[PDB]
Amino acid sequence: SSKIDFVLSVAGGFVGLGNVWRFPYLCYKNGGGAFLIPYFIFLFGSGLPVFFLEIIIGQYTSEGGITCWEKICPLFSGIGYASVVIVSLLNVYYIVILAWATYYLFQSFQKELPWAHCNHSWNTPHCMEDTMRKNKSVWITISSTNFTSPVIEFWERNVLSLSPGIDHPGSLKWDLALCLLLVWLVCFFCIWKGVRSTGKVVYFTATFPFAMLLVLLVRGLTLPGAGAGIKFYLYPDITRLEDPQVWIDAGTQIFFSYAICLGAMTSLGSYNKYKYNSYRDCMLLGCLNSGTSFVSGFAIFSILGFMAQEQGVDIADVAESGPGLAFIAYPKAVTMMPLPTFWSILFFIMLLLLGLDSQFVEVEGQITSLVDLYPSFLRKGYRREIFIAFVCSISYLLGLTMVTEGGMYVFQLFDYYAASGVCLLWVAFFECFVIAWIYGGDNLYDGIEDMIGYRPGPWMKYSWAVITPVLCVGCFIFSLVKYVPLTYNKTYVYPNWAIGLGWSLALSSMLCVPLVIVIRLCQTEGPFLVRVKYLLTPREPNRW
């Protein structure tokens, strides 16, 4: 009987789209090895206390995401609303990945994969086979007039139908629309019916993704040219560390992967009992998720190095330097494996399930929070399923601007600004500030000692008071001083209106805390200092 494996299985899944898709693309965008020096360090902080913090706030107060902060500090109660806005913006574009994966799945039910060869309608005349790119006849006699890889051209001109800019929306893609509608219908059915068939299927849903990742890693390591990719992934560049965008991406990757600032962990902590040693389980889950991300990065960069040594170009210019790196990398190694159809279907089902689990968790948490906001209004009678369907339809309609011709730019904007970036750093800094300098570190340490049984070391308090807030403030100041506009595939410059829309989407969640502060100050009766003292005092009992 393995205690650690059993407790990590019963606790909850820790694999999703934030480690095989977010981490590899963020690492490839930020120079590769140079992305690992800050991230890992940041990881520790951004992994160990903060996540555990959300586990304790939900365990101590025994509340959800919105009502937990109403006991620690009624003044800074806008963190719950900020997390709700963040998850509402995340459910829009995070499920779009499940539409691209679904479309790839329906295109992998044939013997010959379409992205393998250039003999197709969507391919341009500049399409060339990867094996012919280094052939002496084509590489020497024929000039390299912007000849692109077949997989990249297939992806762009058949899945995204990329436009010259975001100003050009184009025509709506019926295939992506139908795939997204089917995924949303599956999500609505699983939510309204309730997912209770996980009594024994958890073993499969946990072993199959890890088995596929292991197979892909073994295949990538046994491919020629993987050494260059491994070196590019491991050997850092000190020049990239000066860029503030690298630190921002490194900080937001962990907050995205560990579901931090989403309020889901605060709800999961309420499910845990009071006298429960959550510290060990949190550390184990964090270390396992970090190891899974580190292993997936090895496979991604080995595939990238193989593609580089086959085509004959630099490692930083092999594929798209943005969202969609896995779809270029992994299908190539799948085609390189015998029987590409079976392995492709397996990988697509794995990715679809990993995305659907996180989507179910996030949407159920959001719906539960919105229902707890107005219980008698959104719970009595049949209005609960009506509200669920309304939220699903609104999210699907808001996700129709990312499946168009000019929809990839909106997807990049939502990935960079809406559910990640400045918003998550702001929320984490405010949470750490309220925990350390407002609520106190010693009282929380005594509470954790009473709950789990032993008082932790000085790492958590120092990270809540010093490490995480100062790091977040420094990253924000560095992004403000040396500000570079967002770029797509390092070749497209976003217009001023797109940057303004992204900053507005970010501020929509960022301003949830200051506005709630003003609302609470105006609602409370009395002098300003008396109101501040009343709203900073832990009025509601924290379940001592």
Among 59, 257, 321, 395, binds Cl ion (CB under 5 A): 257
Residue 23 CB, nearest approach to Cl ion (Å) = 4
Residue 239: CB minimum distance to Cl ion, A: 23
Question: Quick one: CA dihedral 50, 299, 316, 355, positive or negative?
Answer: negative
Q: In the bound complex, what is the minimum distance in angstroms from residue 51's beta carbon to Cl ion?
A: 12
For Cl ion, which stretch binds (CB under 5 A), given 164-172, 202-210, 249-257, 380-388? 249-257
- Per DSSP, helices labelled H in 222-277 are 226-234, 244-257, 264-271
Q: Which of these ranges, 62-70, 91-99, 251-259, 510-518, lies near Cl ion under the rule CB under 5 A? A: 251-259
Q: Least distance from C-beta 480 to Cl ion, angstroms? A: 25
Please say which residue, 17 or 68, places its beta carbon nearer to Cl ion: 17
The tokens describing 242, both together, are 């000066």
Which of 285, 287, 404 lies closest to 43 in space, CA to CA?
A: 287
Q: How many CA atoms lie within 13 A of 87 on its CB side?
A: 28
Q: Is 527 exposed, middle or buried (0-12, 13-18, 19+ CB in 10 A)?
A: exposed
The C-alpha atoms of residue 94 and residue 96 are separated, in whole angstroms, by 5
The three state secondary structure string of 69-103 is HHHHCCCCCHHHHHHHHHHHHHHHHCCHHHHHHHH
**What is the smallest separation between the CB atom of 442 and Cl ion, expressed in angstroms?**
32
Alpha-carbon separation of residue 469 from 46, 430, 445, 462, 475 (angstroms): 11, 8, 19, 10, 10
Instruction: Return the SS3 of 167.
Output: coil
> Which residue's CB is nearer to Cl ion, number 19 or number 108?
19
Residues 6+ apart with CB under 8 A from 242: none
Closer residue to Cl ion in complex, CB, 252/404? 252
User: What are the tokens at 142?
Assistant: 């024929």
CB of 471 to Cl ion, least distance (A): 17
Q: Which of residues 93-132 bind Cl ion (CB under 5 A)?
A: none
Of the candidate spans 52-60, 184-192, 286-294, 394-402, the one that interacts with Cl ion by CB under 5 A turns out to be: 286-294
> Between 123 and 290, whose beta carbon lies closer to Cl ion?
290
For residue 515, the minimal CB distance to Cl ion (Å) is 31
For Cl ion, give the closer residue by CB, 232 or 255. Answer: 255
Say how many residues touch Cl ion, by CB under 5 A: 4
How many CB atoms sit inside 10 A of residue 345's CB?
15
- Using the rule CB under 5 A, give the single segment among 71-79, 256-264, 321-329, 344-352 that binds Cl ion: 256-264
Per CB under 5 A, does 25 bind Cl ion?
Answer: no
Give the one residue of 293, 311, 369, 420 binding Cl ion; rule: CB under 5 A. Answer: 293
60 lies in the binding site for Cl ion (CB under 5 A): no
User: What does the block give as tokens for 228?
Assistant: 């260059």
Q: Which is nearer to Cl ion, 23 or 51 (CB)?
A: 23
C-alpha to C-alpha distance for 286 and 35, rounded to whole angstroms: 19
For residue 21, what is the DSSP state?
A: T
> What is the residue type of 102?
T
Per rule CB under 5 A, is residue 23 in the interface with Cl ion?
yes
Minimum Å distance from CB 147 to Cl ion? 34
Q: Is 202 exposed, middle or buried (0-12, 13-18, 19+ CB in 10 A)?
A: middle
Q: How far is the CB of 234 from Cl ion (least distance, A)?
A: 16
Considering only 98-106, 287-295, 369-377, 510-518, which stretch makes contact with Cl ion by CB under 5 A?
287-295
Q: Which residues bind Cl ion (CB under 5 A)?
A: 19, 23, 257, 293
